[PDB]
Structure formats: structure tokens, C-alpha cells
């Protein structure tokens, strides 16, 4: 759902082919991916990237995932 | 390992689910390369 209001830039530092740009990756998304096993290699990777922001917005969004990290 | 205490543990099985590539090589992306 991307009706209106979407709770998750879909921006996040992230680029749409080539992976997040851990440059410019948010700390926390860096602690989650590394503790997932995605390291900085796949952070950049297409296929890799692209469903871990999907991950992301599964749960609901940035905020969201972020919460899980002191909930589950 | 799937037994994280957070959401990292809900990453691990979403990249599994698809084909994600490990973190290791024979990845799509290249790492740039510089010219003289």
C-alpha cells in the first residue's frame, strides 16, 4: 500500500539498482543488516537490497523495523 | 542464525526466501575500479 502517507521514504538511503548507500545508511539499518548477516557487499547488491527495503516496509516501515530491535 | 532476539532474525529468512547473495562474491554489483 502506497495510498497515501506512506510511514517510510523509500528514499532510506537507498538506491533502487545499486543498494543502499551506506555512505549515507542510517546507523541503526546498519546494526540490524550486520546482525542479519548482510554486510556491506550486499547492502550494495541489487536483488539483495531491493528486498531487504521490502523487508523494511513488510513490518510497516523505518520506525517500525526499529522498534522490533527493543520488541520482536 | 535465525535465532536473533530481534528483527535481524526476521531479515535472515526474508533474503533466504528469495535468493539473496551471500556476503562473499559473484554478486551483481561491481566494486569500481580506478583508471590512470
Known amino acids: 500500500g502506497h495510498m497515501s502517507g506512506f510511514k517510510h521514504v523509500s528514499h532510506v538511503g537507498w538506491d533502487p539498482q545499486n543498494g543502499f548507500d551506506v555512505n549515507n545508511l542510517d546507523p541503526d539499518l546498519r546494526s540490524l543488516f550486520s546482525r542479519a548477516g548482510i554486510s556491506e557487499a550486499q547492502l550494495t547488491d541489487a536483488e539483495t537490497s531491493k528486498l531487504i527495503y521490502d523487508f523494511i516496509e513488510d513490518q510497516g516501515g523505518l520506525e517500525a523495523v526499529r522498534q522490533e530491535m527493543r520488541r520482536q | ?36
Open chain 2, 1 to 36: 542464525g535465525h535465532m536473533l532476539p530481534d528483527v535481524a532474525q526476521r531479515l535472515m529468512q526474508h533474503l533466504a526466501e528469495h535468493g539473496i547473495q551471500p556476503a562473499r562474491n559473484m554478486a551483481e554489483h561491481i566494486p569500481p575500479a580506478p583508471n590512470w
